[model samples]
Target chain A: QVADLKAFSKHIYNAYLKNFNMTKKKARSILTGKASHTAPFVIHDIETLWQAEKGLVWKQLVNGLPPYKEISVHVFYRCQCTTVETVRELTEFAKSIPSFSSLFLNDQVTLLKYGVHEAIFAMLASIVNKDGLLVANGSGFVTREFLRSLRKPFSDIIEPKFEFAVKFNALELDDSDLALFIAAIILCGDRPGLMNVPRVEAIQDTILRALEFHLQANHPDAQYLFPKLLQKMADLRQLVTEHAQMMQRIKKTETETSLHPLLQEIYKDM
Target chain B: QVADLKAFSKHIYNAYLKNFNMTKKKARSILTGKASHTAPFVIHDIETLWQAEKGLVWKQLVNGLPPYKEISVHVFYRCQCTTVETVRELTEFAKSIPSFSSLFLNDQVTLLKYGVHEAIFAMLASIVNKDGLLVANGSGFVTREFLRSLRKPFSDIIEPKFEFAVKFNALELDDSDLALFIAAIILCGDRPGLMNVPRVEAIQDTILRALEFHLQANHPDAQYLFPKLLQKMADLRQLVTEHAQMMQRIKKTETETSLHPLLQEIYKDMY
Candidate 1:
């Protein structure tokens, strides 16, 4: 059961780390409205929506140029789209998380007034307990469209783990837990792919490994979980490395097979 | 009186022709404060008071330098004196002469105002009378001290007559009349030894002859004075020329007779 919750936490952590630079403590600091010390990395003068698709720091985002860098002559934007809707949502949801409010702010919900909602659905999906019950956390994706559309087998696997998450960690986890979990999925390079049987199975293994590593290893109270998470993370790294080598071999074989027809045409004409 | 006035006026006209490049009309124009049609002659930076003292206008009265042909820097003052008090007294006495009042502005009354006198003397010289007594003008010893005592005269006259004085015809004659009369004297070679009594008397006779010619000429009112003035001016020119020749011969004879010390010793040894 403890292992199940650990696996649930690591799954969310891996998915959230793709898009944002955040640690557990830094996440808590941001969500709880505590003054955060993490330096914001800024990239300036994004001419298109694609370059600025992810949020940069406000000053650097608007200043539109970096120190010691020359601006491209043709690069420009109409700047009509820097609306409140883009940035405030993530902050809102971040402030609503339990680790952010209770742990970082000494149990104060400082962000209750502003309507900035973070996408906590990904992070909250990983909260679990030993008993296979949904941790009665206020936030979840049971009602979310994407989770509801998952195939029966995939849904079945996710449901029990989510129930376990909600039961064990609901009262204990704070805003930072949610932030760390979301950061791992969205900011880290662990985006899930197709819902085919093999891919689904791969997704499940990846999620379970990531969650367990994060929850047990990185949890503040469990001094035992951190070292264990490091070891498990090493195991996951080896697995990814082995899979990458196997994929590279298969790709080279496929490329040779695909080129055979073109080679044959050249020889036949000659 | 007309002969004497005409003689003086002719001397002024001729003297002006020699010393300045103005037509009689242009001199009259400047005296009348008329709009000057002539281009301005710029005076360069005269640094010290002494440099200004050596100017062409200054050597007019003090004939310290050898006289140039028709180019004497003739200067004038109706009343010249050393002290401001004497200057004030002279100008005050001048105001009582009636033409003096015509010669200055009410503000120009400062030329005599600071008298600190026992009595209330004059309010712009007690004013009035367009056709009042056309009083006799004074010309007792026109000197350098008298001209310099004026608050501004020296600075102004040195700034040569505008090519055409717009203000001194028969009609616009006010205070400018008095100034022209004074300028008239200096042009007549009225300096102390230069105004030889018989020569001056003959110059007056020539002016009357010129006036008789003016009556005969039937010229316009604008120009009637001019033809008279020009003919009379010619007569004065001939007189001054002859007088200058005589003076030159006298100077040459005196110089010949005078001995250098070494030559005088040679002559004495011969004797």
Candidate 2:
């Protein structure tokens, strides 16, 4: 049965790589300098961007808008679209799980409603390090400084995620470890309004057990990795809470901007 | 040997309860309505305290000083006295450990120099909550609003600690859990200028291992308590760094203000 679970996680991992643009292995190589690298595009404050507009110049133009409010709103738009696409990927990843598929459709929606943001951000740890995150599928990186240069509201929104990422990236988990970790995060039975907590918890315990056993084999030199990952999950919950607060602010003020319908629903109660 | 480490954690637990003015149990009991409680002493701002000072004024005045130094500085002086006493307790707690006792005098000094504030503040979590911190072992209280009401630069300094302590208290760590956790903080191998990193790391690992095992026993219903404690330990280091920075600012800008000699030494490198 454990073998089946292990094989099940392997299938999830395969789905993970197929769905995501950057794999943790690729990220590790690039971050560690084993992969060939190039200078990343720097989008500091609008001056740096606009001065370079720094000729358009066209790159800025393609995403049309009444949009000379350009930079921050564009990033916000990109942020929403990116999250929606990740949720799309997360659904397939969840559906690939026999247990997830076995849940009541309403219960399944409830889990996805609360859990995608946590899972998405957990996967994000694979792509980010202290410097910044990968963008354009390994073609460009966004410096933390650039993200900080966004308009006040958006800048406030982005920095907490960076701080969480910097700490999480230090944990040095690989894709195999992350596969089970993400599963546990989604199958969490603790979410409010859960109809079948026992069933979900059973699934979560199996994933967590697989995660613990897998960590020992995978990170033989490490001490406390599994425990630290659980802490990171708690940290992720706080990060998502702060994000929802800022999105509430954004909704109130940035009437010009729109949130994706799915994301909007996910954040409704929050 | 594990038994010894476990016993050592128990001893530290004893030290924790005996030494700290408020145990988390006392705080939790009062905070949760279990203690024979009274209305917490309130100090909302200068006006309220100034009025109360009319009722019970400067009899607290002791020692030679120019008359009527700023009350904020008065609170600060009292703050330093509390910290110094905390350092004293932390010293006894450290010396009680054989590994710590075995360290070179220089290493012991180095460890305490860097680590006590972290240890102090973690324990401070025992007495603090979102609304305020219980003071003088729950005989009094100080609302965060009062701290926010203070003069400009000082207001900012007090609030971050309150914010941190409030979040930390939510973790529901008991004294036994804190015994090993605080031990781990003091023996942190990561502190700069540690002479024997090997010995320090060895001691820290033992404490960390003891901490995890102790947590499993003491907090059986808890999930991820050990991990959350590690993050909190990391968090305490940052808290102290910000604390040091603000104190350094006061040292520079508030030129007439005085820092206690021992504290000045602790923050000497921080500037």
Candidate 3:
């Protein structure tokens, strides 16, 4: 039973390493100042960041933001757009799973619609340290100090992700472990609107069994990692809660801000 | 981390083995027809069953039943009284846990009040086979055929537990695994009216971790038992839901039947 599970974990790990631009180990090396070849753009001002995205599709990110708050808004915009790309990666990654794609096409979409953000936040821990997160595929670094400098809603927006990331990164799980973990998150049996619950539950049970068995071999010396991961999964749901609230704040207070339709849909019923 | 959990699991196992008269291993031996020394009281008829409980404090179970339904009612009475004793055993077992005793007394009572039935059903799987359950401390055997001979509500009542027990026994969990599983059920974090939820969640987390770890060593070749067991736990909650409904049916249909106040209290807010 565990043999097939071993093969399944390897398949999941391969898909994760192949799809995602920044892996945990690579992110660690870049974020931990092992930056020799990888170009790290440090954004201290809006003009510098604007110059970096200067020729690109900036569209001024909200009718020129009324004030010097353009930079913070720009960062939120960057994170939002980056989240779209991350969602693409997550969707394809989910599709690569055998049982996931076997689900009703609508069920697959539903799972990713609700589950992607949780998976994203969990994977975000990989690219984040206590100070800031690596944005735009390790090409740029946004500091937490700068994030804190922004106005009301924007100032506090990404801090929760950073805090959650910084603490979760302490687990030091590699991409392989995360592969199964993220799959488990997406294939969650508890998600609402699932038409085939027992099927999803069966698939998740298999993945969870695979994950636990894989952990025994991969992190032999690490105690309680499986249980700790489950606890963090619970924590991530709440993390997603505060995240939804903050997005609502942005939607209401910052009336000038534009949200992607997909983003709007994800946040709509949530 | 795991070493402390090991010791904790052992402590829980010792408590269960010592406190409960019936362990899964012993129940298996008896239910599998290996029973030679233990007096196999085969209850084929109501009079013989009454005789077994007659020398004891048999208060006629009710103010004397009207029709020939007396035996089925007698069986129901035996099951109810056995359930009461089961609750007592479960209470002592919970009090024996270190973290459980540390809770506020009110919280302790509240947890047991909600959790005891779920725990009882899970342990009920232990003494039961596909045929029927062993009642009165393994001294008597109640066949499924006879239970079906009972009237409408009482007939269908204990069968759910038997079905659940039959499936649960396939896991072949010994008392040690059950000790932690039962404790996990009782110390559940999601119980309503819990004053100290975080503390209860933490305790259940430790117990669950210990349970998974113990399952690994105890049933090394058993694939997916831990996850399967977790799924069973989910299943047990629904089983409790149905059990509550059945009891409600009994209350409404069987007007002359007497329910213990404790049982009534357990069923009161459920509907």
Q: Top model by lDDT, which number?
A: 3
Better model by lDDT: candidate 2 vs candidate 3: 3
- Cα lDDT tens digits, model 3, A180-200, are 999999999888788998999
What overall lDDT goes with each candidate model?
A: 0.30, 0.76, 0.81
Error of 2 at A161 (Å): 65
Better of 1 and 2 by lDDT: 2
The candidates' DockQ values read 0.00, 0.01, 0.01
Per-residue lDDT tens digits of candidate 1, residues B161-211?
Answer: 111121222233323232233232222322233324344434434434444
Ranking by TM-score: 3, 2, 1
Q: Candidate 2, after superposition: displacement of residue A192 in Å?
A: 62
Model 2, B46-161: lDDT tens digits are 65555444333434644223444675765666568778988998988888765988889888989999999999988888878787777654656667787777666667877888
Please provide the root mean square deviation of candidate 2 (C-alpha atoms, Å). 24.1
> How good is the docking of model 3, as DockQ?
0.01
Indicate the docking level reached by candidate 1.
incorrect
TM-scores for candidates 1 onward, in order: 0.16, 0.47, 0.49
Please write out the lDDT profile of model 3 over residues B138-169, one tens digit for every residue: 77777777788887768888777788888888
Backbone clashes in model 2, listed as residue pairs? A52-A55, A53-A56, A53-A57
Write down the worst ten-residue block by lDDT for model 3 chain A: A54-63
Give candidate 3 misplaced runs (Cα > 4 Å): A1-270, B54-69
